[PDB]
Design an enzyme around this catalytic site. Structure first.
Site, PDB file in Angstrom:
ATOM      1  N   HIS A  17       0.844  -1.176   0.000  1.00 23.52           N
ATOM      2  CA  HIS A  17       0.000   0.000   0.000  1.00 23.52           C
ATOM      3  C   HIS A  17       0.889   1.239   0.000  1.00 23.52           C
ATOM      4  O   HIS A  17       1.938   1.248   0.655  1.00 23.52           O
ATOM      5  CB  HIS A  17      -0.935   0.030   1.215  1.00 23.52           C
ATOM      6  CG  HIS A  17      -2.035   1.040   1.100  1.00 23.52           C
ATOM      7  ND1 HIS A  17      -3.350   0.684   0.905  1.00 23.52           N
ATOM      8  CD2 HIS A  17      -2.023   2.393   1.175  1.00 23.52           C
ATOM      9  CE1 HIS A  17      -4.101   1.771   0.863  1.00 23.52           C
ATOM     10  NE2 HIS A  17      -3.320   2.823   1.026  1.00 23.52           N
ATOM     11  N   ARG A  45      -6.898  10.534  -0.451  1.00 26.04           N
ATOM     12  CA  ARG A  45      -6.764  10.935  -1.846  1.00 26.04           C
ATOM     13  C   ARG A  45      -8.113  10.962  -2.549  1.00 26.04           C
ATOM     14  O   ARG A  45      -8.325  11.786  -3.445  1.00 26.04           O
ATOM     15  CB  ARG A  45      -5.807   9.991  -2.574  1.00 26.04           C
ATOM     16  CG  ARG A  45      -4.354  10.114  -2.149  1.00 26.04           C
ATOM     17  CD  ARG A  45      -3.552   8.915  -2.620  1.00 26.04           C
ATOM     18  NE  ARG A  45      -3.805   7.742  -1.790  1.00 26.04           N
ATOM     19  CZ  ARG A  45      -3.644   6.488  -2.200  1.00 26.04           C
ATOM     20  NH1 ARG A  45      -3.243   6.240  -3.438  1.00 26.04           N
ATOM     21  NH2 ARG A  45      -3.896   5.482  -1.373  1.00 26.04           N
TER      22      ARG A  45
END
Ligand SMILES: Cc1cc2nc3c(=O)[nH]c(=O)nc-3n(C[C@H](O)[C@H](O)[C@H](O)COP(=O)(O)OP(=O)(O)OC[C@H]3O[C@@H](n4cnc5c(N)ncnc54)[C@H](O)[C@@H]3O)c2cc1C
Ligand code: SF4
Ligand code: F3S
Ligand code: FES
EC number: 1.3.5.1
Lengths: 577, 243, 130, 119
Positions: free
Chosen positions: A233, A249
């Site tokens: 990740h 995000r």
């Protein structure tokens, strides 16, 4: 050794293990299911999720689309019939979780809402909040309480399994509070021990995700498939390795280097999208591997910010507003403020890629059965062929309940039609596990297990990172062999019997060393670039379907060597191109 | 550079040697990011390998971390040495039996939580009919009370439990209330039995420390008060029925 | 046999003397002493009131002790603490939802204190102006 | 193991009274203590608002009788309840504590009742 009678025994109280216990109970209301875990079931790693679970729901969605995103995301290393079963069974298990009391976030009309994860075009990820794995684990467990067929053995460290004539007959575990060993007899054993991200120095995993079930499966000849594909990740805190959810995000946050330049547009993820509207597939919402790799490139270009906890990039979230930062994401804001001393309203969060998910796992067919009759594997500790070279975001959770249910029902079936086996051989195997434990306890040499764990984490982080080179991978192989030689000189100086964490952590380290060798060898032999596996040397920086459209199988024989074989990938309706 | 060192006092106990617990003193390097869980990792890695403790997720969501920090019930992963430059004493979680070092007998917690029957009861809907219809309004009635991580800080916070070990406890009550206020559940009467017990809601005198130490902000005390309300309704209804 | 020896820590009668939060709780319960004290005084002045102006004047002379004025001042102090903590804790027994959110306790607290001030005023007005 | 069929408690009764009492003393007690414990035995009142004649007149009024009964009895049940639980909080063992404290409460409730029907 005391012995318990069970129709089937599950090793792991994770989402897969709990869903399997429930499906096996609902399948056989007269069964005696021995559900085992080394922590209380609400302490499994599944609680630590913030993303969600995939399940087709919207009218403009189809099982074909989910199937396609999974196969393509896996770089065509997925068993496509398995993927078909998965996408066709997701809505039944997410709906069933809703029936059991899971508080999925709601549309104002009463139906369950969905958001976009894993880069899918059609949003289909159900979620509770930024607390999804929490509510799903606690829902599965609190629902599991109502089934008396499930005899639980909380805080019981499963040491080994018992195999004779190619059929499983039970397992030997240790009562952790008591320090006494226990035999559990069962004509079916399901492995749900979770992945093995703890072998990396920097990971997002809990301390119990040491992949013990994988190593136990290696000890008995079962191969570990596609171990090379370790999924990183991106956005994760330095030093700790604590996850910053992709929702950051997904709300408008940006990734910047040491020059304040949204570097992602220089790696095929352009053009730059405004601070206002985030667009999926572009800039900070692009492919996961390309963002992590983009961090690696920005590290080669010296555009990363140097920080004692390690080099980082900046996740800037200031352009969301006080109310959207503090009030909308509570757990993430508390996380950042607590562990990196940063207010996401006032300053940007320092982040970097981190070891996350274990695509590999115990080799299983379409019914989660391994090469040993009666022995099953489900969850992250398994490899049903659903993820291939790269798992899609929010797919593992759905895998837990879908393939958990399947593994439960099938395990009931196999335990029903088993027949009997040689008793002297099985008691001989149990006595063998007992003697092996005695051997580990009396072992002396003066070596510290903790420094071996640290050097193993450093070896895995260096040689098996986002990008990989043959020199550093061979280096990690030789270093892992060296540490394997040093593990025989370890001395467990804690001789107590009540909750002797020393011994248990040592055993976890052993399993971790074996699995790590399987990873590093599986990667060094895969001379191509596919999914999370990305190489830099000549002739391997691209995808090779001519020679490597196949699964990497990793065996560990009695002589401590890690051999490899390769199997073929089942295609149904989407050929590679 | 050069990292600072902090003197941590930990309450050790080995049931095979020690008659009663005792303090031990360890110097631990730390910075602005060193947590107490990290410190325990260092101590067991370099100073005393026989120090046992519960932990996992490293980010305050699992719930095995529970322990005492200067007689304050805290999660060891949410406690940072920067705030304890003037002394730090780590005991096992309070009002529980000490099995080993910083591990306690969580049995009673488990038993209470099972006893309040924490699951959906009385619903016949099946998966082939779709999901239940529940509004954000219907969810907000219980949503806050669902974020309980079963960590057990509140049981170390409540003094009525330290006086009454048979008290099912704040967390168990809060979970039971979470299922009673779920619009999808019709099994309130199955848990009213344990709720109306003298070991149920009527053992809380509303001290309020539980909601204060709650690391997930569940506010269990308010659930206890609404549970006293529901229990009084239950009492009166059970009185107006004669026979 | 088990090698366990689970150690149970005792809980003294002085458990509350340690942490200040506990101390605050024990004080909050300790407000019960001057309240029931005041009701006792109310009975005193009731039966002294019905026993003639003689007994009543004896009662008012008792109130002017002045150590009784000290104790009654402490009674007003503790009763004020009781109003404060009571208005703080009472809204938690309510589960009110205002537009998909569980509200309180600030509106309830403001309402209760408003009612209390209105009471105090009306009472002093009827009691002193007429 | 926890009792599978435990005894329902009678607490909801005393917790009820202790409620309404505590509310009463929360809203009305401070001004009463100001009036009686401070203002009256210090002469800080205009004229003969707090003299024997006007006080007795208010008492022998119906509303005066009721307000007096509540003002005495409700804080009694409240505070005495708190004392019963505080006994337990202090680990002081009191024989028939229930009967002791609540019995005294009902005693002083009957006494107050005999006082508000005028002696
Ligand atoms: C921060 C984070 C967020 C994530 N978000 C998502 C998401 O949104 N969607 C998604 O699909 N996936 C997500 N994942 C990944 C996915 O949820 C995990 O792979 C999942 O937790 C796997 O759980 P599991 O069922 O395999 O068992 P785990 O949760 O890994 O638990 C392992 C179990 O095995 C038991 N066990 C292990 N070893 C032993 C032993 N030796 N003896 C006995 N018992 C043993 C443990 O007690 C435990 O019960 C996320 C992961 C992380 C870290
Ligand atoms: S509510 Fe807070 S304290 Fe009570 S159990 Fe859940 S987490 Fe532990
Ligand atoms: S502190 Fe204790 S008395 Fe009740 S309100 Fe909380 S459990
Ligand atoms: S370590 Fe899992 S909650 Fe603190």
């Amino acid at each position: 050794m005391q012995t318990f009678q069970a129709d089937l025994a599950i090793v792991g109280a994770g989402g897969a293990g709990l869903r399997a216990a429930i499906a096996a109970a609902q399948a056989n209301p007269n069964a005696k299911i021995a559900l085992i875990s080394k922590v209380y079931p609400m302490r499994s790693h599944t609680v630590a999720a913030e993303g969600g679970s995939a399940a087709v729901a919207q009218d403009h969605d189809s099982f074909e689309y989910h199937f396609h995103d999974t196969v393509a995301g896996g770089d065509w290393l997925c068993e496509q019939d398995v993927v078909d079963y998965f996408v066709h069974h997701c809505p039944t298990e997410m709906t069933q979780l809703e029936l059991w009391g899971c508080p999925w976030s709601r549309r104002p009309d009463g139906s369950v809402n969905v958001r976009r994860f894993g880069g899918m075009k059609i949003e289909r990820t159900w979620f509770a909040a930024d607390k999804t794995g929490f509510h799903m684990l606690h829902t599965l467990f609190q629902t599991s309480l109502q089934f008396p067929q499930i005899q639980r053995f909380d805080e019981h460290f499963v040491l080994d399994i018992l195999v004779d004539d190619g059929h499983v007959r039970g397992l030997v575990a240790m009562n952790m509070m008591e320090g006494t060993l226990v035999q559990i007899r069962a004509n079916a054993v399901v492995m749900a021990t979770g992945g093995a991200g703890r072998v990396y120095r920097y990971n997002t995993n809990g301390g119990i995700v040491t992949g013990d079930g994988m190593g136990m499966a290696l000890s008995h000849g079962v191969p570990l498939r596609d171990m090379e594909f370790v999924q990183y990740h991106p956005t994760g805190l330095p030093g700790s390795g604590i996850l910053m959810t992709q929702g950051c995000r997904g709300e408008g946050g940006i990734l910047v280097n040491k020059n304040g330049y949204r570097y992602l547009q220089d790696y095929g993820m352009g053009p730059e999208t405004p601070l206002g509207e985030p667009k999926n597939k572009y800039m900070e919402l692009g492919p996961r591997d390309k963002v992590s790799q983009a961090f690696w490139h920005e590290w080669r270009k010296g555009n990363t910010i140097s920080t004692p906890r390690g080099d980082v990039v900046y996740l800037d979230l200031r352009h969301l507003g006080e109310k959207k930062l503090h009030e909308r994401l509570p757990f993430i804001c508390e996380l950042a403020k607590a562990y990196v001393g940063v207010d996401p309203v006032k300053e940007p969060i320092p982040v970097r890629p981190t070891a996350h998910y274990t695509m590999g796992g115990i080799e299983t067919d379409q019914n989660c059965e391994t090469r040993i009759k009666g022995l099953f594997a489900v969850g992250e500790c398994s490899s049903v062929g659903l993820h291939g070279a790269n798992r899609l975001g929010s797919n593992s959770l759905a895998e837990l309940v879908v393939f958990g249910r399947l593994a439960g029902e099938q395990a009931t079936e196999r335990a029903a039609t088993a027949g009997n086996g040689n008793e002297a051989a099985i008691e001989a195997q149990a006595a063998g596990v007992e003697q092996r434990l005695k051997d580990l306890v009396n072992q002396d040499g003066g070596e510290n297990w903790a420094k071996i764990r640290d050097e193993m984490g450093l070896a895995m982080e260096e040689g098996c990172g986002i990008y990989r080179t043959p020199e550093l991978m061979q280096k990690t192989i030789d270093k892992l062999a060296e540490l394997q030689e040093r593990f025989k000189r370890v001395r467990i100086t804690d001789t107590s019997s009540v909750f002797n964490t020393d011994l248990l952590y040592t055993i976890e380290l052993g399993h971790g060393l074996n699995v790590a060798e399987c990873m590093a060898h599986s990667a060094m032999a895969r001379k191509e670039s596919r999914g999370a596996h990305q190489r830099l040397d000549e002739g391997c920086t691209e995808r090779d379907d001519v020679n490597f459209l196949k699964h990497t199988l990793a065996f560990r024989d009695a002589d401590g060597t890690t051999r490899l074989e390769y199997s073929d990938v089942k295609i149904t309706t989407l050929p590679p191109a | 550079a050069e990292m600072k060192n902090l003197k941590i006092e930990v309450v050790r106990y080995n049931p095979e040697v020690d008659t009663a617990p005792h303090s031990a003193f360890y110097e631990v390097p730390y910075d602005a990011t060193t947590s107490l869980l990290d410190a325990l990792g260092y101590i067991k890695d370099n100073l005393a390998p026989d120090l046992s403790y519960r932990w996992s997720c490293r980010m305050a969501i699992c719930g095995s971390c529970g322990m005492m920090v200067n007689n304050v019930p805290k999660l060891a992963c949410k406690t940072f040495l920067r705030d304890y430059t003037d002394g730090m004493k780590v005991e096992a979680l309070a009002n529980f039996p000490i099995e080993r070092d910083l591990v306690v007998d969580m049995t009673h917690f488990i038993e209470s939580l099972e006893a309040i029957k924490p699951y959906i009861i009385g619903n016949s809907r099946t998966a082939d009919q779709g999901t239940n219809i529940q509004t954000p309004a219907q969810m907000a009635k219980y949503h806050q009370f669902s974020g309980c991580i079963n960590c057990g800080l509140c049981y170390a916070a409540c003094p009525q439990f330290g006086l009454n070990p048979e008290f099912i406890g704040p967390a168990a009550i809060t979970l039971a209330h979470r299922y009673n206020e779920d619009s999808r559940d019709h099994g309130k009467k199955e848990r009213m039995a344990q709720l109306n017990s003298q070991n149920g809601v009527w053992s809380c005198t509303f001290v309020g420390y539980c909601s204060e130490v709650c690391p997930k902000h569940v506010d269990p005390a308010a659930a206890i008060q609404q549970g006293k309300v529901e229990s009084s309704k239950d009492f009166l209804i059970a009185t107006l029925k004669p026979r | 046999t088990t090698k366990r020896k689970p150690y149970v820590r005792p809980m003294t009668s002085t458990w509350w003397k340690k942490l200040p939060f506990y101390r605050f709780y024990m004080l909050r319960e300790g407000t019960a002493v001057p309240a029931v004290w005041f009701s006792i005084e109310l009975i005193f002045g009731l039966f002294a009131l019905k026993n003639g102006p003689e007994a009543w004047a004896g009662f008012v002379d008792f109130l002017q002790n002045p150590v009784i004025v000290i104790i009654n001042l402490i009674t007003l102090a503790a009763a004020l603490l009781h109003t404060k903590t009571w208005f703080e804790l009472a809204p938690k027994a309510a589960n009110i939802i205002v537009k998909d959110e569980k509200m309180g306790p600030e509106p309830i607290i403001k309402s209760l204190w408003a009612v209390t001030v209105v009471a105090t005023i009306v009472i002093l007005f009827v009691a002193l102006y007429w | 193991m926890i009792n599978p069929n435990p005894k329902r408690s009678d607490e909801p009764v005393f917790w009820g009274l202790f409620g309404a009492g505590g509310m009463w003393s929360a809203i009305i007690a401070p001004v009463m203590i100001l009036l009686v414990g401070i203002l009256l035995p210090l002469g800080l009142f205009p004229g003969d608002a707090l003299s024997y004649e006007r006080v007795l007149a208010f008492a022998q009024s119906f509303i005066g009788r009721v307000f007096l009964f509540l003002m005495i009895v409700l804080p009694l049940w409240c505070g005495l309840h708190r004392m019963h639980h505080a006994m337990h909080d202090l680990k002081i063992h009191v024989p028939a504590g229930k009967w002791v404290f609540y019995g005294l409460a009902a005693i002083l409730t009957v006494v107050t009742l005999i006082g508000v029907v005028t002696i």
